[PDB]
Amino acid sequence: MALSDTQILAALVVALLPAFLAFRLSTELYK
Amino acid sequence: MDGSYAASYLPWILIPMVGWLFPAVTMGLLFIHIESE
Amino acid sequence: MDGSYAASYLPWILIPMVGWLFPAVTMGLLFIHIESE
Amino acid sequence: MTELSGQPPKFGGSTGGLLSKANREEKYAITWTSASEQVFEMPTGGAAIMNEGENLLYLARKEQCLALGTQLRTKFKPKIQDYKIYRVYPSGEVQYLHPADGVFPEKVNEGREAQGTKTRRIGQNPEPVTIKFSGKAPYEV
Amino acid sequence: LSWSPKVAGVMIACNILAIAFGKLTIKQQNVGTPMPSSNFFGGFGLGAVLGTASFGHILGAGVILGLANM
Amino acid sequence: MFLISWRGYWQELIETIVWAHERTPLANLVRWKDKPVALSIVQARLVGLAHFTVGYVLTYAAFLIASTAGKFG
Amino acid sequence: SHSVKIYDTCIGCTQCVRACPLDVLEMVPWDGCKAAQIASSPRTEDCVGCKRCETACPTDFLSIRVYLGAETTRSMGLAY
Amino acid sequence: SNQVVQAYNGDPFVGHLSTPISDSAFTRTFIGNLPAYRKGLSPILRGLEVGMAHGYFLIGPWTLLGPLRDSEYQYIGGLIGALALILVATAALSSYGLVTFQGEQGSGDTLQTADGWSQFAAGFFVGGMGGAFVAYFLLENLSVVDGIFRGLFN
Amino acid sequence: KVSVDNNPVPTSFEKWGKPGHFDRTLARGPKTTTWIWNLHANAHDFDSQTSDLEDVSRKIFSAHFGHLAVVFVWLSGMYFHGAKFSNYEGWLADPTHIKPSAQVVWPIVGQGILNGDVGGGFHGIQITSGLFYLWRASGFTDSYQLYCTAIGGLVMAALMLFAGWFHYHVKAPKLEWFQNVESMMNHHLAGLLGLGSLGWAGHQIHVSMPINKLLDAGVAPKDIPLPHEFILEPSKMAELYPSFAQGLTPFFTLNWGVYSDFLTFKGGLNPVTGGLWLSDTAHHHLAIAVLFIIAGHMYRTNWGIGHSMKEILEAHKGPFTGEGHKGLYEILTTSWHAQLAINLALLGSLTIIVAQHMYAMPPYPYQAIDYATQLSLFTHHMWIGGFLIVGAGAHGAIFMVRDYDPAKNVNNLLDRMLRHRDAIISHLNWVCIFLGFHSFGLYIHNDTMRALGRPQDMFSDTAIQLQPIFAQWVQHLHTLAPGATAPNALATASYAFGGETIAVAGKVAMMPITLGTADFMVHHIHAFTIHVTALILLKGVLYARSSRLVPDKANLGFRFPCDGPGRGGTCQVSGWDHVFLGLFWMYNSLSVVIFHFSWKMQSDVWGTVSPDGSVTHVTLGNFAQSAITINGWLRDFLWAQAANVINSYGSALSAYGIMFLAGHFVFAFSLMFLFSGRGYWQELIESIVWAHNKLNVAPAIQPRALSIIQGRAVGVAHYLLGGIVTTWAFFLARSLSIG
């Protein structure tokens, strides 16, 4: 009934793109 | 110390990464940045 | 894999020599020769 | 002759242009005088906007420069027949290559010299037995 | 699901919503076959009013068959 | 491959590989001393002839030996 | 470089000069034909050996020959 | 304008394109700060940096996929294979620098010089065998590393 | 908006006696024998004869009518041979046991042995095209309906021929009628595709559903009611389906839920006949008709509403893409070759989609049981699709050479794609080499690990296993689809994803195809060969204008042999020779694809069935551990399954042996044209002209060798003919031997 390892890895992959998008926002907020 | 949850192998590498590997390269990049000209 | 013949110790060193040590120094000497001026 | 006067044409940039041979061994440069702001296809790839007046374009081979000269002389109704193809070295020297006599090679003028002209037919060529070890060629001697 | 004023009511309501949609966002509307007047809606014309009534029917079959099973 | 295809295709391909090596960032350190071109026409004819020959000879020396050594050995 | 030799069978039809896309051939004056001109190749270090001059020539066994000799950066046509 | 891909370094006749993969700000601050490219280093240190990341990962494909993964001498065969590969690698690049930089000996950009590339070869060999031996030593004592990351030696 | 010129070309037979009049250099006189080959090399090059965009377009339109007459007389021949010289009513009496045959052979030289006993006393050659199952799906009962369909097809063949003569010599349309591309697109969407789908939906409702329903009940031939009798008496149709007593009236009030008994969404297969459900396909064609005619009103023609495609192409422009599609509407309505390249690309991919869909969802009754029909239909549609995709790569290059004007499309997508041709091809060949090592070197690696006696180091399933997890997860989603993500569907989309084993007449129709590591390796082989053919054709498209080797490629033409032996050598540099190489690479790609299909389906899918539920396959499950080796592909597939072509003499499958050896002959004959060059053969032919001049018999037509492009063309033509004939003979003889 608990979670699986593939759900945790999918959560890491689906949170990888907020890291890229926050990197884009931080870069354009610096300049 | 182990993990009963799913993916117990993952904090075994994420705790030293965010503890050492993330702050060492963050302080390295920041010290290179704030002391350059 | 062994050798029932006399001097079974000898292909044990002659097979890696003619396989690696001879062609590496032959190609090294030839590439030094054909690209020099 | 020694100085290239011109502006670069309007072009976005390509990949088949000047490679690492340009700043090391040699490159070429075509200069011509346009009439309007028309569009020409460079042999590097894609189209470019030919600027008004005297403009300069850097290429990597002489064959691309002569292919552009053919495109300038045939594929326009104001036929551009006053282009000059120079060879630029990385040392800075510029060699006037074409049409260096001043007139095009398709027509004859006085001042040229017959270089590489034989006085015989091809059937009157010598045989490679009499010059078998002289080191020369059967067509040269 | 058969002929009723309920299915006809939601059909006519989404149809006239589609007429308002065509009157709001069609780029060129009038230049077709001319309508006799402008009494219906807008200044559409014959082909334009056939188009927005047909989109009213497409939208009609959409919400009706989307609610006949729900 | 050397028999059917000819040189001009492979020269157009080698132009692109040269461009990719000259515009890859970390491989701009390693540059060729001799300019890489395609094999010449008579040359790669001879190479395809050599592969046809030694390929023929190796597959027949495999079959001719093993079939009659499987039947009589 | 290649060697472009032009024999005396040339009739001065200047097809080979306008066919070669590298500007090695050029018409020099002559007195052995009706056109009173013959092609000549001074800039043989720019010839790649494409033999496009040996496709537009009207004589039997064409009066211009391109003997493929040595190679270089120009004769191999390399942009790198 | 709003176009993100432009000509490389202003002039549009060099065969390259200023592109968000090629010439973005992040690319020219990350590739330009890689050891083979960042300014202010001798080639011995930058060869030592390049060598360590190459030696550290070459242990992997032979300790997991090599022929000695059946037996108990798994990591020893992985180290032996990677030492052979880095020895061939430094033989290739030292012979490259032996034959390419003979002659004119250009002054600037000291990596592309014969003494510079030989310093790069010495650095690559030291970093290569050291990264290979560290990855071997950290894979052979994996029970120790697991014990000091889980904290069971206390 | 119709613009027609009246009588542009006079009808006359005097031009037929002067061959070569269409081109300027051919009508002078056949001074040389190469003129003969040029007469066939420029006979359809309509862009080189006329250069005004109006004469060529009406020439194309009349050529379409002539080719349509060729397809109609071919289809008439199929229905006539199914009427007169077949056993269609005999096969309809007993479909499971006897085998179809629609060609009887005249016994003249001993070829009466080709008329094998196909079942029921009828002799003939057993057909593998499988259009008998098409006829049973449509609803044919007796041979007279096939005969009248052949007669009506020949009538429409002569009608299309008369329309071609009428539209070239009597009333030919103008250029503005051809350039009305939005009217052409929405008429072809609604009135051709959607209206034709509605016609076949009506035929499937009225004819194909009741006839196949009572044929699945078990009604014998000469007892089925005639297909018009269901319309003439609707009670015979209302006793089969309860919804036909409701009439047309629930359709117009959107009471379609009462039509659910005869427009079902069953899916899967029919367990009685081993095909798709006819109610499912009737509902399917009706839905495609509605969606196409809806999409058939998108483009404005005369009434204001509608999308003119020009501002559609104007509106799509991003930061990477510069000016976007600005100029493509002027390209695709002024150049027929760009339209031909797009249409050949999408028709080729459509035909490959047809092959990849007609094996796991068999749409015809008793089609999945006949293994020869299934294998032949798969591989033939695969080959037609791959051929048309190579033609897309050809006509892209012809558009670049002779139909590309660079002054009109500046900084658009075509100019930007031609501006970074190196950054496309130098990554495409990298992924070609990466896929080449990682799909073929895997095969060499476990070939070597099996030859060195160490099977634990291979890439097998018991060895290091490369499990294809993505397609296995997709198969799990398709198995879990009906009830969760397709709740009104009873069965799956197919039984190849996952489900029960469908058995009809002692054979297996479709069982779930599991994907081991052998399917992983062979799919990467498929992606590799697809990438290489899409490298040769794409670098024939992009490098057709100019290059750094030869920057004068546009003035030399599309079809030239070389620029010369200079620059090291420039032979096979044109855009034509990339098609010449891509044809071999299409041959290699599709040969491996149909080999993977034939072996996987006869090792893991086909075979007989047993009443306790166990399935025994044809090759007893060889694909698991023996499809990962090159020696496994040679021994267990090309040696073991070719024995049915080898040992079949003195029998019905005897022509396939002398087509097997025939295809090997044409392959080996192609090598003479591919390997040798022209000047040898010219130096030899001139000696034969000497031997003819010695006896005063030398012809005044000057006899000389083929052109260099001609030599490469006949080499690739005989290569592809010989290889495809060999594979055709092998596949047909094997799958007719196994049943």
Ligand code: CLA
């Ligand atoms: C927040 C993160 C964090 C984490 C995860 C740790 C973890 C650890 N600390 Mg620690 N510490 C921290 C913060 C942290 N600390 C802070 C903030 C302080 C200051 C108050 C301290 C002060 C401290 C002291 C005073 C001591 C520790 C010790 C220890 C270790 C106990 C077991 C041991 O001896 O390890 C053995 C040592 C190691 C595992 C060191 C790491 C070496 C690794 C294995 C080599 C990998 C390098 C590799 C080549 C590069 C890979 C490249 C990469 C990209 C993959 C343990 C690893 C004890 C110790 O002995 O540590 C040395 C000890 O005495 N810590």
Ligand code: CLA
């Ligand atoms: C013709 C000669 C030849 C010989 C003798 C070998 C021998 C070997 N190959 Mg090999 N191979 C060859 C040709 C040859 N190959 C060719 C032509 C190819 C290309 C197709 C390959 C491709 C290949 C692959 C793909 C693999 C092998 C592997 C192996 C090894 C199997 C056991 C192992 O893991 O070793 C362990 C590794 C070694 C013994 C490496 C040598 C390191 C030595 C011990 C260090 C000595 C250096 C010393 C400091 C210098 C001394 C100085 C001197 C003057 C005395 C074995 C040593 C397998 C392997 O794992 O090898 C790494 C493997 O996966 N080979």
Ligand code: CLA
């Ligand atoms: C090209 C296909 C291919 C592949 C994938 C393999 C793979 C393998 N072979 Mg092999 N082999 C091949 C062809 C191939 N072989 C051929 C053609 C032959 C000759 C007939 C052999 C002969 C052979 C022998 C004799 C043996 C093997 C063995 C092996 C296994 C271990 C070898 C090893 O450690 O590699 C070492 C490889 C490397 C050190 C290179 C690693 C490259 C890295 C991964 C690239 C990374 C790129 C990176 C991800 C990109 C991003 C970088 C950055 C930007 C982040 C391995 C599964 C051995 C075994 O035991 O089998 C199980 C063995 O004994 N092979």
Ligand code: CLA
């Ligand atoms: C919609 C389909 C279509 C259409 C309309 C065209 C139309 C055209 N193509 Mg084309 N092509 C297509 C598909 C198509 N192609 C495909 C799919 C391919 C890939 C194979 C090609 C490959 C191709 C090439 C390579 C060339 C053309 C060329 C041309 C143009 C001139 C045609 C010509 O001279 O041939 C006239 C007809 C023939 C020469 C007859 C060919 C006979 C073949 C080779 C043998 C048939 C074998 C037969 C099936 C087996 C039985 C025979 C025997 C055993 C009994 C013309 C515009 C040419 C061109 O534009 O040059 C400027 C050109 O060079 N095409």
Ligand code: CLA
């Ligand atoms: C069986 C013969 C054969 C082979 C092996 C190839 C192989 C190849 N062709 Mg090819 N070709 C052939 C026949 C063949 N062709 C024919 C007959 C034609 C005529 C139409 C063509 C036309 C053709 C075109 C038009 C193109 C190719 C291209 C390619 C390359 C694609 C990259 C790839 O697969 O990864 C590389 C795969 C291999 C080299 C095969 C794997 C073998 C093993 C794994 C390697 C050996 C292991 C190791 C090195 C051994 C060491 C031993 C040591 C002593 C050296 C590849 C080298 C393309 C290319 O080069 O660009 C990408 C390309 O554009 N081919």
Ligand SMILES: CC1=C(/C=C/C(C)=C/C=C/C(C)=C/C=C/C=C(C)/C=C/C=C(C)/C=C/C2=C(C)CCCC2(C)C)C(C)(C)CCC1
């Ligand atoms: C993040 C990221 C990335 C990266 C990744 C990777 C790929 C990484 C790698 C990593 C690695 C690869 C690492 C490594 C490391 C290493 C090291 C750390 C080593 C060290 C060594 C040592 C410690 C040794 C020492 C010694 C000894 C012991 C003895 C001998 C000598 C010597 C001294 C040398 C990329 C690019 C994608 C992008 C962005 C993101």
Ligand SMILES: CC1=C(C/C=C(\C)CCC[C@H](C)CCC[C@H](C)CCCC(C)C)C(=O)c2ccccc2C1=O
């Ligand atoms: C593939 C190919 C190429 C490309 C060939 C290239 C790029 C050569 C690359 C050779 C690689 C480096 C392998 C060479 C190593 C071999 C094992 C040979 C060993 C070296 C000897 C000196 C012993 C051509 O240039 C060519 C030219 C004319 C007709 C056909 C073709 C042709 O088919």
Ligand SMILES: CC1=C(C/C=C(\C)CCC[C@H](C)CCC[C@H](C)CCCC(C)C)C(=O)c2ccccc2C1=O
């Ligand atoms: C043999 C050969 C020739 C010579 C080709 C010739 C002589 C063509 C032969 C044609 C003869 C006349 C056979 C006729 C062709 C068909 C059989 C005609 C069909 C006739 C029947 C229907 C009656 C080349 O010209 C050539 C050119 C470039 C590369 C390779 C080659 C090459 O290999």
Ligand code: SF4
């Ligand atoms: S083409 Fe021949 S005949 Fe004419 S000028 Fe040149 S060499 Fe003389």
Ligand code: SF4
């Ligand atoms: S070979 Fe080419 S470059 Fe040389 S003279 Fe002839 S046409 Fe000119």
Ligand code: SF4
């Ligand atoms: S071999 Fe033939 S195709 Fe190749 S360059 Fe020479 S003449 Fe041209």
Ligand SMILES: [Ca+2]
């Ligand atoms: Ca082992």
